[PDB]
Design a protein around this ligand. Structure first.
Ligand SMILES: [K+]
Ligand SMILES: [K+]
Ligand SMILES: [K+]
Ligand SMILES: [K+]
Ligand SMILES: [K+]
Ligand SMILES: [K+]
Ligand SMILES: [K+]
Ligand SMILES: [Mg+2]
Ligand SMILES: [Mg+2]
Ligand SMILES: [Mg+2]
Ligand SMILES: [Mg+2]
Ligand SMILES: [Mg+2]
Ligand SMILES: [Mg+2]
Ligand SMILES: [Mg+2]
Ligand SMILES: [Mg+2]
Ligand SMILES: [Mg+2]
Ligand SMILES: [Mg+2]
Ligand SMILES: [Mg+2]
Ligand SMILES: [Mg+2]
Ligand SMILES: [Mg+2]
Ligand SMILES: [Mg+2]
Ligand SMILES: [Mg+2]
Ligand SMILES: [Mg+2]
Lengths: 205, 184, 132, 111, 243, 177
RNA sequence: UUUUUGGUAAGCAGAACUGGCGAUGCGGGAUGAACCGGAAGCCGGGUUACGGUGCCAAACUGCGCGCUAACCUAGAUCCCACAAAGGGUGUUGGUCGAUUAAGACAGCAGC
RNA sequence: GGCUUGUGGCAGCCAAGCGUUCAUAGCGACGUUGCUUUUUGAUCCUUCGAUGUCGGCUCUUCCUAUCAUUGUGAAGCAGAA
RNA sequence: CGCAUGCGCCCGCCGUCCGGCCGACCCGCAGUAGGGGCCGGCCCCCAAGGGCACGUGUCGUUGGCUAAGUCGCCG
């Protein structure tokens, strides 16, 4: 993984059905190359091995604590967004200034809060479950894992996501109708544009 | 060793409306409607016409084992909406009679005097399952419903609610046990 | 119900490697991972299914036919014409054409697109005021 | 229409400064690793070999009536298999430039 | 090596740190679960500890040694004069917990409550809520106040009333600066809660409207202070030998 | 075109002596990655099977054997002897390939996978082209079907070349059998 | 490393041949006097050794086949930082034998 | 403290026999495979320009190879134990 | 959420002057042993590998006019 190398002011990633570790490594490289990344819907991230194995792993993590002063760490974040953030931190030299700056360019959210609900969201094929996990093998959602280890906002995110999706469906229908109104416009413009369509014909899909 | 094709077929009765879409099977009959989610099976369901065909391509021996399981579940749904399921249980006791109290429209039962205990054991029937005390037979319960899993599981709840403890169960045979697994 | 199957006569597109973009006919199957493919302009050879994309075209041939028999079967089914006329097959052709446009040709296409967009936008405005 | 104010013609592509030529335990600042946007293979790198590079940054003081500074370089050879290149500049780039962008010009031209 | 003999540890680790509380008034950490089917009602009340005494009553506890006998038991007197509602606040349920949406205050605020907003009331100009109180005097301002209330009805999920004590009525306390707290409203829909709260603006809520006789309540407050203290008294560790 | 393993006929004999001016000539069909390694394994067997070491032997001829019809599919049976962690064993394997070189390559790959047997712990006893009706393994029989038909259950999603590789894409892959 | 004595054994004690460390940095083995590579004036370019190419971290989430699913912290690289006898109707290969369209096996039916 | 584990401690495999009958409810002779560092030895690597050397008292934390307490399986478990 | 300093402070303008951008254009959801579009048949998918955009002028010459369209700013 060398990096995307694209010039963008900001990249918004939809993490739904992305493998946690593979998404983390790709994003870690993007952040280290100076790319600003926003990750939404972290509760829908997928972890291979299944809930039982992943739950046992987190419980072993909960055991780790400074015996003489538990407040001195390690800190066991329960929310999906923080778990992703901590997973990425393990793949970055976060104790150096270079690493700290890279982490400061990352933002993680559960669900899709504004203004990102109206911003195009991309996916990362190298981390997609449909391409990385064989159908029939165990996996769990990060939101489900977080709920069982002490994240109590799962329902709140679920209701807000349903409200957002219904609004998005309404907006989708408006664009769908606007597209049907535009295919008529081009047909009407066909008579005016005789030479222009000839040039575009060999290039049109 | 992955077999190229493993397939099994079953015949759909004439008076059944079976609907399949993305491994979501819905069966409707005179008694009601039943639906089961088979999205956890990596199989190919197809209705050919009526018959139901389930295929597994390049599946290991474990994967092909689910082909017959899927057909049996679909067959149970067909029988559930056509004939129904009737599980009969018998009270077994040596000294203390077991007193049963049906309530809530045959959707609940309370067991009292099990081995003389003063504790009251309450069991609620699952969705679509009704429990009725039989009159032809002495100390017999009858559970009826469409879904075999719910009816059979309701009987299991009653049976396990009346387990003897701190005693030799070989001699203390008290309990409620399933005596017949049939259909209405 | 699957739409495409690996079978003798199936026309496949090479989706990876040097032979990318070429059409081949599956004339025999070696195992689960490999098939024997033949084309009019290539020697019969084996290749992995990971480099093949099955199409909707399927000619009627017997197992491992002769080149002359294979060629006439493809022409009888108009394999090349069907593929190029299809939307999927046209996508590959258009991609090559776009990459082959010179600087002057790109300038002409820009003018045509700019003028096309301007007229279309005017038509939409009329469809908005009238058909609100 | 946008009404944007800025450069009207772009005759360069952006490249990201990834770091220096290095091993697991040593660093060689005399060579820099640059990722050129759009170049994804070693074969594609051949077109950019010898092309001039410009690292433009802003200083606090004014020199020649400007806060801009430029360090010139060029593409020397490809690095790895994924289109990264090795670049040399008149002076070794500072570590501060890691993650910054450089302009990859289309000259000197062989076409 | 293992300790020679076993005894439980001294003190509880669930009350750490043993620091001075960052507050003087008892904070309600958790309000009762809300039941919409019930009428709107307050869930908390402020009072002042007056003192203790003992009472005698005849116990009615079947199966107990005290059945139909008399028992003497200590009791605490808490003086609870009616509280005055002076505002309403609404919270929205967010993935980051409850967030305060808006706060609507009553037109008239007593001097006792206004003292709570100052460190030196007498030396100040007493400008608190003067500009806020003016928008109740105009039709456009009244519409804005009503619009804010409708905003709470639409988005708020938790409604709490701002209530303060009438501390002047207890001259023994020698204090004129009243105590203010948020009291959650349980029961009814969100609209009813807002209407319930707004209807009490500048009105008094007696303690009887919140609690009644023979019910169990929780008391929250700050314990008596005792300053720097050694381990024997602070934690209950046993003393060492005389020598 | 290119094979990992090549088949060679190696012909050799013991050096002529006064007692035997015309010693017996031995031939073997050996598999190796090149001629040099084929010769070395030829002397290994002659040393241990005919008591003729290379130091007192003579190499006569070495020729590579090529598949006759590399465009058709044949069934290949391979009889082999291999060493496990606890002893020696014999097994018979079948493969389908266009050339016996490919079938031998599959055999070495399978032995490494299913038995953790390295290349140097395998001796090939016999190879042969088996007709379809005489095959024994079901992994080979199931493809003896004139109406062979199946879908591609597992596909590999990727651009034709890394030139069209991008880290980010607007939509997920659309896959259907 | 190998040969080798005493000792249950030891990062124990004592010999044989060679190399190494000590007197020596440098690359790899996360970390390490001895292991692997390799020995060095001060520099530019090129190429490698051992070891590597998901991130940390320079180099593929490269092109191929199979095996494994770990509800024990599955497993993950010479020295090296451990595991045994004995077991599994877990699963995958192979070897020998027996039965079967003249009808086996399971169930069903009355040999 | 470290290496080692003979010795000490703890555990498994085979099944002659015991167990009224009955190898394996509960036991396991003759053998054989291990674990542990809460025994004692073996060694002499660290410390002799000094690491305060018995036990108790006090106080916290940790382990499980579980004495009691919660939930269960087995018995030569009728009940009780 | 309240109140916020008279030789001060806060805003709306106008100038003066000071410390990484180059088109930095793009909101469907869901599935992947499937999902849509049309009349059980026929089509579409098989990566944004797309679409949009005066995209055309020395960050852009002078002087006008300017139908609609697109875009920015402004109550
Ligand atoms: K002690
Ligand atoms: K006390
Ligand atoms: K004491
Ligand atoms: K086995
Ligand atoms: K021992
Ligand atoms: K000493
Ligand atoms: K322009
Ligand atoms: Mg790298
Ligand atoms: Mg008992
Ligand atoms: Mg709390
Ligand atoms: Mg005091
Ligand atoms: Mg010594
Ligand atoms: Mg010395
Ligand atoms: Mg190591
Ligand atoms: Mg050099
Ligand atoms: Mg890989
Ligand atoms: Mg074993
Ligand atoms: Mg013994
Ligand atoms: Mg000292
Ligand atoms: Mg000292
Ligand atoms: Mg000391
Ligand atoms: Mg235990
Ligand atoms: Mg007894």
């Amino acid at each position: 993984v060398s990096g995307s190398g694209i010039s963008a002011r900001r990249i918004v990633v939809d993490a739904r059905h992305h493998m946690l570790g593979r998404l983390s490594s790709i994003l870690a490289k993007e952040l280290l190359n100076g790319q600003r990344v926003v990750v939404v819907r972290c509760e829908e991230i997928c972890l291979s091995g299944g809930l039982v194995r992943q739950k046992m792993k987190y419980l072993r993590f909960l055991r780790k604590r400074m015996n003489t002063k538990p407040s001195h760490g390690p800190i066991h974040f329960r929310a999906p967004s923080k778990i992703l953030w901590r997973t990425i931190r393990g793949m970055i030299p976060h104790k150096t200034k270079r690493g700290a700056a890279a982490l400061a360019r990352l933002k993680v959210y559960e669900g899709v809060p504004p203004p990102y609900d109206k911003i195009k969201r991309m996916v990362i094929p190298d981390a997609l479950k449909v391409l990385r996990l064989q159908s029939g093998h165990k996996y769990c959602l990060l939101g489900k894992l977080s709920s069982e280890v002490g994240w109590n906002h799962y329902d709140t995110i679920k209701e807000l996501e349903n409200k957002r999706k219904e609004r998005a469906q309404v907006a989708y229908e408006r664009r769908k109708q606007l597209a049907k109104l535009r295919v008529k416009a081009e047909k009407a413009a066909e008579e005016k544009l005789g030479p222009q369509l000839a040039v575009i014909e060999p290039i049109k899909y | 060793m992955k077999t190229i094709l493993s397939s099994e077929t079953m015949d759909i009765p004439d008076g059944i409306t079976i609907k399949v879409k993305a491994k979501q099977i819905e069966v409707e009959g005179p008694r009601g409607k039943l639906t089961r989610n088979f999205k956890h099976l990596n199989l190919d369901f197809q209705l050919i016409k009526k018959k139901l065909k389930i295929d597994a391509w390049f599946g290991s021996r474990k994967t092909t084992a689910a082909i017959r399981t899927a057909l049996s579940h679909v067959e149970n749904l067909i029988t559930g909406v056509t004939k129904g399921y009737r599980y009969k249980m018998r009270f077994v006791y040596a000294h203390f009679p077991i007193n049963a109290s049906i309530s809530g429209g045959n959707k609940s039962i309370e067991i009292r005097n099990f081995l003389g205990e003063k504790k009251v054991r309450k069991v609620d029937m699952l969705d679509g399952v009704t429990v009725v005390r039989s009159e032809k037979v002495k100390d017999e319960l009858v559970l009826d419903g469409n879904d075999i899993e719910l009816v059979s599981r309701s009987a299991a709840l009653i049976n396990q609610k009346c387990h003897v403890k701190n005693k030799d169960i070989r001699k203390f045979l008290d309990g409620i046990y399933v005596s017949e697994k049939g259909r209405i | 119900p699957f739409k495409r199957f690996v079978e003798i006569g199936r026309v496949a597109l090479i989706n990876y490697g040097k032979d990318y973009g070429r059409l081949v006919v599956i004339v025999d199957v070696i195992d689960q991972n490999r098939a024997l493919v033949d084309a009019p302009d290539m020697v019969r050879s084996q290749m992995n299914f990971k480099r093949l994309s099955l199409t909707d075209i399927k000619i009627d041939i017997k197992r491992i036919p002769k080149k002359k028999t294979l060629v006439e079967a493809m022409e009888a089914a108009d394999v090349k014409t069907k593929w190029e006329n299809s939307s999927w097959g046209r996508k590959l052709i258009v991609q090559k054409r776009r990459a082959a446009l010179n600087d002057f040709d790109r300038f002409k296409l820009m003018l045509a697109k700019i003028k096309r967009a301007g007229v279309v936008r005017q038509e939409l405005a009329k469809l908005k005021k009238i058909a609100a | 229409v946008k009404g944007r104010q800025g450069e009207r013609i772009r005759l360069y592509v952006r490249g990201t400064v990834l770091g220096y030529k290095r091993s697991k335990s040593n660093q060689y600042p005399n060579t820099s690793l640059i990722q050129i946007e759009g170049v994804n293979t070693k074969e594609e790198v051949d077109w950019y070999l010898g092309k001039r590079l410009g690292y433009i940054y802003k200083a606090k003081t004014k020199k020649n009536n400007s806060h801009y500074r430029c360090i010139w370089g060029k593409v020397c050879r490809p690095h790895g298999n994924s289109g990264v290149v090795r670049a040399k500049f008149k002076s070794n780039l500072p570590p501060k430039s890691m993650g910054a962008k450089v302009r990859v010009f289309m000259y000197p031209s062989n076409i | 090596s293992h300790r020679k003999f076993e005894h439980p540890r001294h003190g509880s680790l669930g009350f750490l740190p043993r620091k001075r509380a960052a507050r003087h008034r008892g904070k309600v950490k958790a309000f009762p679960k809300d039941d919409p089917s019930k009428p709107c009602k307050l869930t908390a009340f402020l009072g002042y500890k007056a003192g203790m005494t003992h009472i005698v009553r005849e116990v009615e506890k079947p199966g107990s040694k005290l059945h139909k006998k008399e028992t003497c038991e200590a009791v605490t007197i808490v003086e609870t004069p009616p509280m005055v509602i002076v505002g309403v606040v609404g919270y929205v349920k967010t993935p980051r917990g409850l967030r305060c949406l808006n706060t609507v205050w009553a037109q008239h605020l007593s001097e006792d409550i206004k003292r709570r907003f100052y460190k030196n009331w007498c030396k100040s100009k007493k400008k608190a809520f003067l500009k806020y109180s003016k928008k109740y005097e105009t039709d456009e301002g009244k519409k804005d106040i009503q619009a804010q209330l409708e905003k709470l009805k639409k988005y708020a999920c938790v409604i709490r009333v701002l209530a303060h004590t009438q501390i002047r009525k207890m001259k023994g306390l020698k204090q004129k600066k009243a105590h203010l707290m948020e009291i959650q409203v349980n029961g009814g829909s969100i609209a009813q809660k807002v209407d319930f709260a707004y209807g009490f603006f500048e009105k008094q809520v007696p303690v009887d409207a919140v609690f009644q006789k023979d019910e169990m309540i929780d008391i929250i407050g700050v314990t008596k202070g005792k300053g720097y203290e050694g381990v024997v008294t602070r934690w209950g560790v046993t003393r060492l030998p005389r020598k | 075109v290119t094979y990992k393993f090549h088949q060679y006929q190696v012909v050799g004999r013991a050096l002529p002596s006064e007692n035997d001016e015309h010693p017996k000539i031995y031939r073997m069909k050996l598999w190796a990655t090149n001629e040099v390694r084929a010769k070395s394994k030829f002397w290994y067997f002659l040393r241990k099977l005919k008591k003729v070491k290379k130091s007192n032997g003579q190499m006569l001829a070495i020729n590579e054997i090529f598949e006759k019809y590399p465009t058709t599919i044949k069934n290949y049976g391979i009889w082999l002897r291999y060493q496990s962690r606890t002893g020696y064993h014999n097994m018979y394997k079948e493969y389908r390939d266009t050339t016996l070189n490919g079938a031998v390559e599959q055999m070495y790959t399978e032995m490494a996978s299913r038995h953790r047997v390295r290349h140097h712990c395998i001796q090939i006893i016999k190879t042969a082209t088996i007709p379809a009706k005489l095959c024994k393994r079901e992994s080979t029989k199931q493809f003896h079907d004139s109406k062979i038909k199946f879908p591609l259950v597992f596909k590999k999603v990727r651009p034709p070349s890394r030139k069209l590789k991008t880290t980010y894409k607007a939509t997920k892959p659309n896959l259907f059998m």
